[PDB]
Amino acid sequence: FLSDFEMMLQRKKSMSADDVVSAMIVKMNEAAEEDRQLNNQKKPALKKLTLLPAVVMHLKKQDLKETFIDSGVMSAIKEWLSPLPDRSLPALKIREELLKILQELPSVSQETLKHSGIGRAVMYLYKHPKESRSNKDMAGKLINEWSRPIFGLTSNYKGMTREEREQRDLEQMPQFCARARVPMPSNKDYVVRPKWNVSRLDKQMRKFTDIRKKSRSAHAVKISIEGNKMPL
Amino acid sequence: ELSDDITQQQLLPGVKDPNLWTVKCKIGEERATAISLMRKFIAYQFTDTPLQIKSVVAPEHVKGYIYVEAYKQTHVKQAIEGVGNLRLGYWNQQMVPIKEMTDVLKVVKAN
């Protein structure tokens, strides 16, 4: 039989998906198609905008971003960013959140952009005249961010190796007073990288510290003297 | 016929390009400074300590600074050393991040 102590300990100890991602993408396609039908009926296309919170709250899950990208999220986002039958842009919220998500979804490979058409779908919004300036800036930076890899460029300055900088620095090398005067830092351009210039007491002190601790007039429950850190 | 913007994405700046550094100039003397900084560059280019700077951008929409492009920040400085209107931006120059460089040569619509 279990002891009440072990029941308590086990009870407290007891406190410590690709299929649902696929189903989410299916629901995103259903929502965008229903909004196409509603737009043809000249009704408000609420389905995408009604699902948006649930979708955004899941695309942010760091542990699933690979699953999301590999499951065809880029295709669904392209469908949501695409203009409707009357060539109107999607709800402002959809553009704002999906563009922000795409910035936070950097693992996207070139083949993924080319196959999903998400690049076309964002370049479209970047060119589009009815797009707001903030969305145009997001689309612009997305287009730069996604095109740099095509040209092998990169924007992470911490990404260039040490030897690359040392080599580049060699590639770029050219051919009275009455009081103390504060000297100013050397402006010299350093090219060349310099070669490097290369207990019995604490046991007794710990023992004495332990004796000091042992001598204290401590109490089992720390009484709040002035009401600070009062429990519950 | 390749579109103009697509042929443009190719030119973007990378980590391997000379960084564009902000400096600080006396307002309305940014153009007079950048040009005088050309005369400084020309005067030193043949001596033993030529200026290690590549370009100095003084946008019209901005009012307060010229930007010096140089591989290493300290190159910007040796150029601006002793230059008067730029004496204010001598102690510090902020690198405009690689993603906020294309929007320095941004012009929105002289006329």
């Binding site: 080319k114 370049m123 095109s147 095509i150 | 390749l2 697509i6 994405q9």
Partner: peptide, 13 residues
């Protein structure tokens, strides 16, 4: 080849 890649990825008529 590289601009054609960018054209196919961002080409919008």
């Amino acid at each position: 080849a590289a601009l054609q890649e960018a054209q196919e990825i961002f080409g919008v008529d």
